[PDB]
Design a protein around this ligand. Structure first.
Ligand SMILES: CC(C)c1nc(N(C)S(C)(=O)=O)nc(-c2ccc(F)cc2)c1CC[C@@H](O)C[C@@H](O)CC(=O)O
Ligand SMILES: CC(C)c1nc(N(C)S(C)(=O)=O)nc(-c2ccc(F)cc2)c1CC[C@@H](O)C[C@@H](O)CC(=O)O
Ligand SMILES: CC(C)c1nc(N(C)S(C)(=O)=O)nc(-c2ccc(F)cc2)c1CC[C@@H](O)C[C@@H](O)CC(=O)O
Ligand SMILES: CC(C)c1nc(N(C)S(C)(=O)=O)nc(-c2ccc(F)cc2)c1CC[C@@H](O)C[C@@H](O)CC(=O)O
Ligand SMILES: Nc1ncnc2c1ncn2[C@@H]1O[C@H](COP(=O)(O)OP(=O)(O)O)[C@@H](O)[C@H]1O
Ligand SMILES: Nc1ncnc2c1ncn2[C@@H]1O[C@H](COP(=O)(O)OP(=O)(O)O)[C@@H](O)[C@H]1O
Ligand SMILES: Nc1ncnc2c1ncn2[C@@H]1O[C@H](COP(=O)(O)OP(=O)(O)O)[C@@H](O)[C@H]1O
Lengths: 398, 407, 382, 398
């Protein structure tokens, strides 16, 4: 009985968050936690409109969230078709911002009428940047030099790669700050975003390094040199996750008819807003109009870590006069740090798997590991370009 | 399936009609009785275009209030995405207790934040202050020459020129109160940063309306001025920028607490000394080595994002809203207690408008006691929400830093 | 270093200091080619340098005439980089043939950004709010301005980091670069603030929030010292004949190097080709603090197609933080005063203080634009 | 004859700079240029105090400066001894800032009394970052991938390495912006700062690349991706020229007696000024008190390119409690991008060679090429640390 389970908890016997570790069902656990919580609110009827029934909590519990009191529905709209690399995509966008999906759809239209967009993945590798300390700067310098010898690296790479199937440690980037040493480990991770995997590899690699340098202190597995979820020039300059570039040419006629402006006006707005304005504002990596809007909408729809829009949104949007008469619009978007995955985390949930299926990238790519994640990154970059096209045209037209 | 001329009806018939008269899918809301069937039909149309027609099987869409969404929050709707909502608390802040809703799919985040809240509560709670409040829009205009743009800048800096602009700006809404103007010249280009409070609304739309009218007025004084774009990226909205870090955008907030040494050992499993050492070398030195502007924290974006999604905020705004510098130092008689503070200069937030107009997110705002407009004191609900965000970020910083220091 | 505190002649003290030093060198004959004789050490001693062992001669070249704001300037440039003066001179030529350049000073105010601490963040917030009120500012201004006839406090920009409070004081300073003057005003203003908030601890008169001699977005965004903009239009014919290239090629190089390249490199304020070269050469020649080229060099160079045929080159250079002065420091020495006289800006402008320093800042911006023009043409031609 | 040269030049409109080729002696050509110039000044007697006589213009002409009208004397002071890596240095500083030499000397004293400082060169390599363009982003991506293959690199390295003896192409860091491709070439350069040498190598390497990709357009030999003389995160994160770290421990007694403060006060000032203050100001690389002051003074004295203090001054100064009682001051300075040389440019002049000799690093190192330049970089970092120590103490003291 609910009432007596509530009475049993209000006897200080069970901590509110320890409900599923007792109640014979998930949804009922959620229901009781809600009742307990309501008594603590200045307005006990607050949760009335927060849904919770008929949701598959099995996949959520012990994997995606804790102290669950329900779920938050985010409207999902569709933008497309997105003509990219000779394929057509119907892009799911979870958002509460009016006109965003419509504007992106218009961008997609202009691209399709232009013969489509092309994209390339330039680099792939998630990172973790721990910070270690030596007794002296002279010692940290010795460690840095050691890590730079082919033998020292092979040893570290062996330890790193030995923690998982996908741990393939690439180049190692190090930076010294006195006796501190920041080490940026970079590795592919199949179709997973890879933070957990890279962390495991990093911990074992640091153990191995410790055998060679017993005086080394592991201060933190993350010394903010990754850099994860904080703006940083290092991600912009070296990339993090997937580095992608996309491009398209919009015929003058399409710019006039679909976008309601001219190539010349677009170019002038892009230079003075996305380049000069961002420069005047002191931006590192924010040379675009609204890439974060598109990245965020797709991330939420596809079960990505939305907090990662911080670095994933880095983007430089470039526009140029093209064609016989210099009236056609050449556009490109370069995104050096798209942190994305199609396996793990929120991608394990069914509704988000549905959005990934819609794009044909759900789960692991059996025949070619990482291909689904790479495809998703290309789709993001292409949709960002469609969004940039549309909003820039609107700003150009006034 | 009836012939098209004969063709409220049958699904297959609407589809056959749609295909034939080539009606775009998004116009379905204005062609079908219920909203739900509108999406149902769009889903069916879409499924035929997918390499795997059964893709949408697990994407929910039934029994959702689309009335509030249509023509306001989203277009081409094919359903909704459920994000798990967890609760962290109580958060003892400014002598009140908050139960904080967090929408996320990252395991252990809610649990970790809850631990942080616990440590704070056992320490006597946290205190916070709103330092500044004002959303911005930074349009770019052009004059024929740099000499002319300089003239405009100087004019905008005279008390009379400003009053004129402020009058035009303020005439657009009750809450539109032009605070100040920061201008910057790049040759003949002139970037003008308009800043104004906006009641309890995040305020982008309102500030934009005010900016357009103010630019019209400015145009009367300088007919040769060309309005290149209502946003010249000088706001700066949704892109990382030093200007938001240095001047603030939306709400600037600071939060602080002192964690007793005993609580650091027992709840956080570490020492004040270890925490301090990790904070300095990760949040300060590490962020400096990585070339960060505004990212002097461990994971403020995780907390900001989770609360934003739960409360109907614009999640894309976590880009600048997440700016934060986390500081830690020895406190107390024995210098063994942990003093901690989080300073967030640019929290873009609102409790009225946008996604906050939807019922499920209004529920999360009600849970915090900040839903909608504050009748008695306009903007107070939005300011309270910003303080809550900064306080929860501090709880999250406390917990994650402890785990990093510890093992 | 106490030699001129004892001995009679300055030149002798230097000879002796050299002798003493000589004993400690692994090559005592090294000082052989370091000059020291016949130099006026009187002005240097106790003002510009200590432990003096001589002087370092830097070649001074001349670029000009620089046609700026309907005047012509012969610009002195101290440098050891070959072709720099020649390249800048070519830039000046192109500008002169284009009808000259125009410039405007947009802002003027040196800064000092001390860091203070309160017991709690709640207290530092209280101090910030007090500082933003008209009465609070008036008293701090009253205190700041009482230290000098030239010190006039313009505004205050404050920033909180928990219980720390960074306060950026900004004030004009006549024709002086103004660091010393602003520091004096800041110390007195902080004393006054302390009377209102006794629990406040003055951690450092400079908390790096000024920001002096370190790259910082704050100087780029708010300006520091003099903010200046310069512009000119170069006729298509002049671009072809003097610069050996086309307007179209120049524009393409400027966008992809100065804008896109600097963006890819993660630059804050470095959207130019080589402004530091010009700033440094003029600073050394004119007795400025050369270490200040760090922020003084901030610059965004922009190029556009201009004219009826859209074949003429429009160019502009915007420099938000030129830290400069024509009185004090190295400007007190005769050789550098000679370079300032050459420009007609030596010493204080008695009638309107600040005018000589403002004129010098315009000259720097104009010369930087001449240098940008020439080097970009050379990069575009290839 | 003097006055007759004037009439001739004015009569044929012979450019002043051409005087060198005209006259015989260098000084007479300078004397005449001054006379010509004086007639054009609002105050003809302006040059009265600008020296020009008895200076060796032979080395300057056609190498260091043009349109010469004299020389500017900068006072040279000495700070030392600087106890670094078990050696003692007498450091020449050219400056007009009062108390700078005195303050730096005090810093040196505290270090000496602490048993000296230790330093290490972490990396060495000057750079040039040209920008090239391909017709499409898909093509620039192809070029990037090609440059990353071991065969493509070897080919480029061969072409680069063939322009000089010291040209040893280390690595390549590439970055795409749509159809633009920025390529950062990095190479050691013996004891020379290396800009000219690296530029030569870059031009030839770009020619070779053009043979493989005929559609590639070389937009500019420097696309600002080097980055030379402009502030940039890339130099901070990847280094440029010499990356150096220096450290020392100052006994508590020495901190009290020589520096007039406490270790605790120093530490508090360093954290809140050099770390937090610089962070609040939005600095990239400026986590120090006044490294630029020391870099500039030494650069001018030693014939370095003073405009390079822009990036050479990047520095992070760190302080912490050390010793048994935790009362001694540990200090370190890390400078990732010291652009320096002991051969070429202004180092070819005698007075500056004198300052380099004073340090024992003048010219090339026959047996260990680059050693003199590396030694000079360590000296700069060590002196910057002495300057940081002293000024921080005075700020801490009040
Ligand atoms: C529905 C959206 C796409 C959006 N749509 C439109 N349009 C008029 S539209 C539907 O035709 O594409 N306009 C703005 C808009 C943007 C800036 C502005 F000043 C006024 C209006 C935004 C606003 C977009 C906002 O999220 C980000 C934007 O602020 C970033 C920036 O440019 O700085
Ligand atoms: C559940 C979360 C809070 C999280 N929790 C924990 N814990 C062990 S916990 C549950 O005690 O708070 N640890 C990490 C973690 C962080 C860094 C690391 F190297 C390994 C693991 C993260 C990871 C959090 C991640 O999203 C952001 C993080 O990457 C930011 C950064 O510090 O750079
Ligand atoms: C005499 C000088 C002005 C100089 N002159 C010339 N010329 C060809 S010139 C005399 O005709 O103006 N070219 C370079 C030069 C510049 C970049 C290059 F890759 C190769 C050569 C420099 C070199 C310039 C150097 O100081 C700064 C420069 O590196 C800044 C940058 O553009 O990144
Ligand atoms: C003679 C010098 C070493 C110098 N010396 C001294 N001293 C008191 S001293 C001679 O004992 O070392 N003090 C300052 C000084 C510094 C900051 C201040 F607010 C007031 C005075 C400077 C000023 C130094 C200046 O060039 C750089 C400095 O501004 C960088 C910064 O700290 O931001
Ligand atoms: N509600 C919407 N949903 C999706 N796309 C939309 C929507 N409204 C406009 N668009 C986009 O804008 C384009 C045309 O816009 P417009 O000329 O305003 O006509 P309309 O809005 O009636 O379709 C469409 O082709 C489509 O890409
Ligand atoms: N599943 C969870 N949901 C919410 N909060 C949790 C959860 N697990 C732990 N916490 C938080 O972390 C704190 C630590 O609890 P636990 O890990 O059981 O260790 P301990 O028993 O040593 O306190 C709890 O007080 C609570 O605030
Ligand atoms: N040694 C120099 N000193 C000063 N200016 C020079 C020098 N050499 C060239 N210049 C400048 O550079 C421009 C180019 O002239 P020059 O070098 O003769 O080449 P060109 O044959 O292309 O005209 C001239 O306008 C002149 O002002």
């Amino acid at each position: 009985s609910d009432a007596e389970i509530i009475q049993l908890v209000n006897a200080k016997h069970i901590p509110a968050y320890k409900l599923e570790t007792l109640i014979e069902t998930h949804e009922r656990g959620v229901s009781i936690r809600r009742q307990l919580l309501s008594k603590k609110l200045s307005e006990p009827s607050s949760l009335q409109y927060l849904p919770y029934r008929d949701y598959n909590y099995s996949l959520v519990m012990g994997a995606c969230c804790e102290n669950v009191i329900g779920y938050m529905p985010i409207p999902v709209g569709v933008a497309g078709p997105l003509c990219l690399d000779e394929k057509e995509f119907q892009v799911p966008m979870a958002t509460t911002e009016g006109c965003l999906v419509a504007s992106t759809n218009r961008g997609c239209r202009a691209i399709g009428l232009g013969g489509g967009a092309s994209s390339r993945v330039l680099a792939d590798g998630m990172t973790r940047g721990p910070v270690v300390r030596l007794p002296r700067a002279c010692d940290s310098a010795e460690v840095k030099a050691w890590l730079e010898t082919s033998e020292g690296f092979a040893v570290i790479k062996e330890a790193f790669d030995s923690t998982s199937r996908f741990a393939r440690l690439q180049k190692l980037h190090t930076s010294i700050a006195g006796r501190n040493l920041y080490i940026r480990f970079q590795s592919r991770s199949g179709d997973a975003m890879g933070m957990n995997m890279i962390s495991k590899g990093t911990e074992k690699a640091l153990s191995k390094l410790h055998e060679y340098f017993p005086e080394m202190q592991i201060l933190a597995v993350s010394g903010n040199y990754c850099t994860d979820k904080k703006p940083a020039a290092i991600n912009w300059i070296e990339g993090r996750g997937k580095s992608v570039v996309c491009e398209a040419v919009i015929p003058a006629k399409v710019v006039r008819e679909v976008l309601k402006t001219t190539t010349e006006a677009m170019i002038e707005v892009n230079i003075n807003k996305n380049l000069v304005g961002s420069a005047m504002a002191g931006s590192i990596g924010g040379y675009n109009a609204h890439a974060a809007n598109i990245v965020t909408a797709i991330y939420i729809a596809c079960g990505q870590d939305a907090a990662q829009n911080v670095g994933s949104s880095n983007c430089i949007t470039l526009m140029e006069a093209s064609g016989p008469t210099n009236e056609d619009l050449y556009i490109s978007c370069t995104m050096p740090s798209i942190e994305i995955g199609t396996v793990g985390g929120g991608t394990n949930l069914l509704p988000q798997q549905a959005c990934l299926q819609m794009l044909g990238v759900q789960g692991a790519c059996k025949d070619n590991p990482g291909e689904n994640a790479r495809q998703l990154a290309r789709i993001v970059c292409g949709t960002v370009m469609a969004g940039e096209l549309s909003l820039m045209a609107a700003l150009a037209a006034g």
